[PDB]
Design a protein around this ligand. Sequence first.
Ligand SMILES: O=C(O)CCCCN(CCc1cc(F)ccc1OCc1ccc(-c2ccc(C(F)(F)F)cc2)cc1)Cc1ccc(C(=O)O)cc1
Length: 182
Amino acid sequence: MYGLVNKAIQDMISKHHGEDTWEAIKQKAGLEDIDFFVGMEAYSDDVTYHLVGAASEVLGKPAEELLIAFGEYWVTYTSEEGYGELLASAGDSLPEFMENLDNLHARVGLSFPQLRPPAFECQHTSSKSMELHYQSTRAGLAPMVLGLLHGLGKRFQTKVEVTQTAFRETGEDHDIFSIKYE
Ligand SMILES: O=C(O)CCCCN(CCc1cc(F)ccc1OCc1ccc(-c2ccc(C(F)(F)F)cc2)cc1)Cc1ccc(C(=O)O)cc1
């Protein structure tokens, strides 16, 4: 994925656990070569997973867990580090922002074509409930979506309960989440 995701992981770990740890996780992930990640450069999705795997061991936490944390962090990180207005242009509420993703990503891919964006459909069951379909060319990032949602919940001071009712990794076509929100 574009370096942007890898810098984010690095920024989070470093900020929460110091460079010593980050350097460690980097060496273990077998990436002690890469002196630094380039934001607008396309890397092999495997580069990210390796960082997730190494961070899992080095921190004694499970991948799925860190992915949740990274989900939340991403929403904050992007607004700060050069993507505030892009995010601001996505809406003034969770439900709206989620409908804008497909648009938002298209909007982004234009600048960066090697972008392989996921699809996000939404059936608004009610005015406080919606069903989210997450479709991706990657595997094992459902947990990050979980974090992403909560991050959006904080961004719009909205209480939100997210629970996953279908999992790709277990055969099912694609991940599906059920969402309740204040
Ligand atoms: O793999 C999957 O299925 C998706 C895994 C989850 C990661 N995606 C989160 C989507 C999301 C969900 C959400 F709920 C809130 C916010 C969200 O993001 C807002 C946002 C998304 C992207 C940029 C941005 C900014 C700059 C750049 C570039 F560097 F210039 F290229 C590139 C992307 C900014 C803000 C983003 C994503 C998607 C594809 C690629 C790639 O294909 O590499 C990289 C990252």
